[PDB]
Design a protein around this nucleic acid. Structure first.
Length: 106
RNA sequence: AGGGU
């Protein structure tokens, strides 16, 4: 939605986390989001699925300032995914594999 | 780094 007045925070904010980074920010064992909840002192609970965007909405509840703090931890964790871990192939570098050569020997 | 409660 065109929320031109979305500059106002509150006691619990809805943060848009990329759907390809949902498990990332929480961690495979949830150890990661516990750190976010720890360093911010907030209750971060992923909602079912608002579906109103290419992201997932997570309701970071708690004291507004801490919600901002918590939001930053998740957002920065996304920002660090942006060419953070360098990958030669797969991304900006197509592996020059042959036409089935290597596996297609017959 | 896919599910933490």
């Amino acid at each position: 939605g065109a929320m031109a007045y979305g500059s106002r925070i509150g006691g619990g904010i809805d943060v848009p986390v990329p759907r390809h980074s949902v498990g990332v920010v929480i961690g495979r064992s949830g150890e990661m989001i516990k750190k976010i909840q720890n360093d911010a002192g907030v209750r971060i609970q992923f909602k079912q699925d608002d579906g109103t965007g290419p992201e997932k909405i997570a309701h970071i509840m708690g004291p507004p300032d801490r919600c901002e703090h918590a939001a930053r931890i998740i957002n920065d964790l996304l920002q660090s995914l942006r060419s953070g871990p360098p990958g030669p192939p797969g991304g900006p570098g197509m592996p020059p594999g042959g036409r089935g050569r290597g596996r297609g020997q017959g």
